[PDB]
Amino acid sequence: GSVVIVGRIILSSITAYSQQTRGLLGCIITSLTGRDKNQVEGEVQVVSTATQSFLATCVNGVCWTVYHGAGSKTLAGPKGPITQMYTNVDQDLVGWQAPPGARSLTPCTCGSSDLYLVTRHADVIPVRRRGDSRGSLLSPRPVSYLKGSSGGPLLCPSGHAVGIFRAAVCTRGVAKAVDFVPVESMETTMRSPVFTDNSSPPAVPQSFQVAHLHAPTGSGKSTKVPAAYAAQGYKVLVLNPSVAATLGFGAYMSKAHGIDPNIRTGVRTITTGAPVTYSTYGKFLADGGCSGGAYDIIICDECHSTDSTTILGIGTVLDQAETAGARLVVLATATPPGSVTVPHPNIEEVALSNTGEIPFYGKAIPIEAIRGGRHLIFCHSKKKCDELAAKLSGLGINAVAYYRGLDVSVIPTIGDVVVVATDALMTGYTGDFDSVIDCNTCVTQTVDFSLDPTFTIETTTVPQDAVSRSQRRGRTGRGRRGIYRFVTPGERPSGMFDSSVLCECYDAGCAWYELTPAETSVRLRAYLNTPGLPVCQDHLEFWESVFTGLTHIDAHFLSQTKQAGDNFPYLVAYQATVCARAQAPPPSWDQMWKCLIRLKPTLHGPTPLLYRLGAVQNEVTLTHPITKYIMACMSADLEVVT
Amino acid sequence: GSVVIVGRIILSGSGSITAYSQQTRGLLGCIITSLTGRDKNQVEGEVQVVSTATQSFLATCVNGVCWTVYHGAGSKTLAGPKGPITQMYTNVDQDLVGWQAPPGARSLTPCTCGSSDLYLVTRHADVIPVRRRGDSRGSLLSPRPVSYLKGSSGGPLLCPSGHAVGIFRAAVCTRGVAKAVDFVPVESMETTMRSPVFTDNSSPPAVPQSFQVAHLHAPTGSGKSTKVPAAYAAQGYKVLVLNPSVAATLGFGAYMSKAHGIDPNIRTGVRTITTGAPVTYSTYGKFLADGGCSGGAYDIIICDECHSTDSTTILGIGTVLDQAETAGARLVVLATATPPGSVTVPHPNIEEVALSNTGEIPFYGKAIPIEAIRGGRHLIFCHSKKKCDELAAKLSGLGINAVAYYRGLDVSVIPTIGDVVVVATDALMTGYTGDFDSVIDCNTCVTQTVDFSLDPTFTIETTTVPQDAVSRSQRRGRTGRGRRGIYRFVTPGERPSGMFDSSVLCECYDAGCAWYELTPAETSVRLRAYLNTPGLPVCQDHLEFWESVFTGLTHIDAHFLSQTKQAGDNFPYLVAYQATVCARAQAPPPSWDQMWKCLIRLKPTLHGPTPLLYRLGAVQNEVTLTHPITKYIMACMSADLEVVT
């Protein structure tokens, strides 16, 4: 789908009023076609994706809005859809050349502090400038009031543009201030190149440089280029988020380039004294980070990964490399933020239909598409993998499930196989397949600042992003012809991750890498402060405060939660600890709370509840000093998207 | 639009019950078929995935009828192969609608074994084991989050044999965890199929020998509250007529003497008259104030505008139903033009006109042309006091004679005689009785919803919503009164009529305590009477829960209570109780919004966190959750609350 203009806010002492122009079927036809033949008027537009609705502002003949709304989407145009002229994921800003009929705001000249926010309902809201990019609501309002209004203008009293609205600063759900993209950031963006080239790798400079490398997987970005660099006399470190891939790099290098490198994974370590090391992000973290004077180049490969260990690993590299003697860091990926899935020459893309013996996600797979040869099926959940795998095994198809917890060796290396796998496959297993069949969904975790008493980590099934889609399909076409079959054509925007992932970082810092909340903050801030990386609301102070007060965990409970491989081993073990000491039962008797099963006869009364990680079946008490500490943490200013 | 079949669940033919889904229409195809009402795809399967332009859910074919929930499907047609299928059955009480299924539609049949091991088929084709615990209940074998059961209402509960026990309609929660399921049993569907499709309630009933409840579904202006009291009284009966509005109450009384030659008794706050006539016009408010039914006084009780879902009307009809047989009445008539399930049909007098973007006057994403309103008498429906003020100011500027009217203003502001454009909230239709040359409708209103949010207790959220079939009809019918009229609108759409929020029940306990000296227990009896009487607006039964809350709200400050009552805003009792706790703690209120004005004079003396009991709006101050009363309401939240899926 394209973005669709569904109406407009008209502007006059500033006043505003709205006009609707499209309906539901009008929005959805024009989204599918990309052809909007309807005449654009005014300087603020009301815009829609079939998911969401927001605002767009014309300044300098560019119609502008928020990346967190528009993503990399086309805008529906008279002569078909409009490619975005500008994309700045770092600034949460996108832009299309203004349609005919559209007027523009002129940027703000004279330095006014008294500002006016235009909302999607056409209310004009007094705002006092505080920073380059912050203004504070003269009268605070529910955060709900401001939702639907991002991309909207902040005007000075002259009616010129100060910038566009992107986020609300919040105290226990009440919006106190506004975050905005300043009109000066649009001019920098308009000045920046149409296309920058990062296909070719940098040259090792005189002083420290952070560089970016955008190139296909298996171009040589993690094989040819390290060897190339080492040929020049350099010591290089290669970081990857997969054990399987890290391991495999060792045997390929010693064949391809005569370098028998050092391999560092949790499971296995090889020290050869070569000038190339391959390490995982976790093993790099578990190691202490940057070994003083050990490396000239660090290559952070697969830097599009938004799992806690990658973000924490990369952040560590950016905080340490320059002091630890490095000259070059880089950041390597085939799918940077703001990328979209484009045709690949070696891959046939075929949508599924309702014709098929095997039901798949409301569509069907014909048994003839998978009967012989090697095929891979992405399911979103462990439960689906087992169901599907069972079906096909009954049909006589050589089928196997793979997910977190299972050993890789369930997947046969050599025969006919259907591998029914979650994304866990893409860290356990290196191989390529004849076809890939994709459900186009994954399971993600969202933080909810629910004040019932504190926060919640929800687990939801969501549409895949453009990174997922491409990484998944990239399991076929590897220098040979592959098919890709899919349930839905869609993709949500690449390059953003949830605040829960920051929580995951502090947790893993504490559980695995013996990192203080303060030291985690140092590392994440580097990741956050570096452009070209995935983006996230800055809730570093908030999570640091939360984990900072989580003291004297039971180490035995810690061991057990770590051993089990739960998400948030630290958050779970700390609840367990609190329950033990309070002599009170756990939130429920789910497998999460296995470690307390030995105390089940003595624990009674209400749960000293800290935060919600799943279902809560017992009564709760808000009296624990710790619950009280976290409740107080909730009063922090949190930037939430509108 | 119509309900559209977008897919199906396929249930295993053999052995263990297992299901898979097929998707048969994508989103655009769904939207077109909603508008055409034409769907020439063959209906395969017994269980169908259905969608409206808002929600999605399930529909099961049983015995030739395709059944789903009223709360999902309202009174909508079903997109069929010869265009849209009207509903054969609409049961708002059972929460059950039925369309005749397309020919050769695969249908289920009821179960003949009478087994207690049951299986719920969910919208993503999970077969969940349920244990039968009643006629309409079953318990989950392992409890699950209630979010998991969402969009699965209208789906089957199956015996191990694969035949239909019932259709799923709601989950029973403890604090967001679903512990049990409420369904409509398969015999309640055969009751229905054996019974007449068509009923008549257009005529006032004959007075029965012994006590009976009867419905009068007749237009306003067939004299349901003038002509029919008079004819009952001419037959020699004593009649009491109850109405939500004091303007209407006084207005019918003054007409009754003018026309039908009885000076009736009148009972309202503002004016009370005893003549000794066998006809009494009273408001529901004044009736409750009087202590409800006084024995031997009336043979007939007309509960008029019985569609009204304000706390006083529900309390009123609850009282009449609980008391009237015992007070020796022979007949209760629940009279309305717009009963539950009803739909807006054309009117002969009213030309309907869809507002465009061509006009000088912006209105709700559209435009009013001054030509339309420049002379004569016009009424403009607006969801808020803000918009009324805003538009009357624009129209005053455009030089149109424009008065704003809403709750807190004197009906005297509107001229009876002259050229006028009154810009009103729905406060109009209870405060003012007159009609108009045209009516303009924004097609939205403001409503209250409860959310059991556990932050610490509950939220009453105030929201802006699409209007329902009841609103549209009452608003529209303020024009075309026995002459021509023009109804101008923003939206063709209307939501389903005859359902109200659990927040209204809260309002009934609140009015009980604040106005009518009812113990919570006294209110639960009155409300039960309403709830178990069919043919009235329906609501999730949260009586035990609301009762439990209010029962612990003892020793309110009487002063604050009188200040919140006078001020006329919603929940005077929950507001005056929150302020009581605050003042006695020397704590400031949740905000310094108009709500908390009764604490303003004490602002300097008020310090520290608010001892927060519940959320009635924005909370700006720091809170404490230590108050004995917060703890009591927290403890109430553990009650089995039924919620729709």
Ligand SMILES: Cn1cc(CC(=O)O)c2ccccc21
């Ligand atoms: C959490 N975590 C992930 C890894 C990756 C790996 O297995 O190499 C790791 C390694 C050592 C210590 C902790 C580790």
Ligand SMILES: Cn1cc(CC(=O)O)c2ccccc21
């Ligand atoms: C809340 N409330 C509404 C009414 C209706 C009326 O004014 O007739 C009423 C009457 C007496 C006491 C309280 C009352």
